[PDB]
Design a protein around this ligand. Structure first.
Ligand SMILES: CCCCCCSC[C@H](NC(=O)CC[C@H]([NH3+])C(=O)O)C(=O)NCC(=O)O
Ligand SMILES: CCCCCCSC[C@H](NC(=O)CC[C@H]([NH3+])C(=O)O)C(=O)NCC(=O)O
Lengths: 208, 208
């Protein structure tokens, strides 16, 4: 196949890209590497890291650049400049939350999980609840009736946070409904069921 | 008057945006706020954070989204899909280095500065030295002859690292020369010399 996505055998940074491809029914090689095999191939990647998307003869690293490239190719980058900017801004906010999440996961899970759930996460989710409402009253997708790459990133971030704290979206009905809407899309429903059956690790250290 | 960039009175995340605006002769209000004034206006921003670009009636937060929007608007976004993807990838790499840099600056300057300079920074710069060479043999700008938004980000990242370690580019001829080339652009030369004579801090904690 012409698309190949190389990453570790976890959800991590690649999962929104996987979700984009699965939902759009773009067939790809999901190339999942063992942690010990990475050293021998790391020099092949431009910053020594994954994920990497091979798109025909093009080798593209950096998850955000991969997503935006696919978005342009498949018309999921908004319909005008303002929409393009908005989904970019939204998606960058999602990345900020993921940074806070991964710092807690990898550096301080045993002591910072509880405080993160109680004192950090609610205020961060509230920013998205308010933002999501700006188009289509937040009752469909980030841009309203048309899907964009930012929807896959937000879906994943809400999903991993619900694993972490099953009740984190209780006070956020728009985010809760958005999450379920995205999970109900036929190709994602099937994919997420298989992902759960295999208990795919969210992170590289087994914590979630 | 049609642009206002609101950020703290440091270089930080805003500086590549300032550099883009100045060098492209885009007039803007450089709205540099005091740290104690931010608490009172925090809720006006979509993620409670700066920088913010007011572009006419549009309010755009997230430094990467801001710079990508300006690049589209002023045709500094590459001339085809591969170029646009490439500069995105390159610029995201620059941001990754900045994350390493700021973590050290804000969380462990006294214990981690020397190990950063000796044992992290050189391998990170080597990645950029190799990558720079893929277009124009890396002997002009990131895309070869045409400037792009990524050039401003690479320039600022190289400059702040040269403040940290004056000798860091000695053994990277392409990056060294790129830095020389960018600093000699007349609008940047004027702006940067005024900034540095005014002792504008790189970071918010007085370390650099
Ligand atoms: C234990 C595996 C799980 C770690 C989770 C972090 S994502 C993997 C990490 N890659 C990155 O940090 C990529 C960051 C880049 N900014 C992006 O968004 O793609 C990597 O290749 N790191 C491997 C390495 O540097 O050796
Ligand atoms: C305090 C001076 C030093 C600031 C250095 C960090 S940048 C300022 C910080 N903003 C961000 O971290 C924005 C990150 C965002 N991902 C972006 O790229 O714009 C902020 O508004 N923080 C203020 C806050 O959260 O209250």
């Amino acid at each position: 196949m012409s698309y190949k996505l190389t990453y570790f055998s976890i959800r991590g940074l690649a999962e929104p890209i996987r979700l984009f491809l699965v939902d759009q029914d773009i067939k790809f090689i999901d190339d999942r590497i063992a942690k010990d095999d990475f050293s021998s191939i790391k020099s092949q990647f431009q910053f020594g890291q994954l994920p990497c998307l091979y798109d025909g003869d093009q080798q593209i690293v950096q998850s955000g650049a991969i997503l935006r490239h696919l978005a342009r190719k498949y018309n999921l980058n908004g319909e005008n400049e303002m929409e393009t900017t908005y989904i970019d801004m939204f998606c960058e906010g999602v990345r900020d939350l993921h940074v806070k999440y991964t710092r807690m996961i990898y550096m301080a899970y045993e002591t910072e999980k509880d405080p993160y759930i109680k004192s950090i996460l609610p205020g961060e989710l509230a920013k998205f609840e308010k933002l999501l409402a700006t188009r289509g009253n937040g009752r469909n997708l980030i841009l309203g009736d048309k899907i964009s790459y930012a929807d896959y990133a937000l879906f994943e971030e809400l999903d991993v946070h619900q694993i972490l704290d099953p009740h984190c979206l209780d006070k956020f009905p728009l985010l809760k409904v958005f999450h379920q809407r995205m999970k109900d899309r036929p190709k994602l429903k099937e994919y997420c069921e298989k992902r759960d059956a295999a208990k795919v690790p969210v992170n590289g250290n087994g914590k979630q």
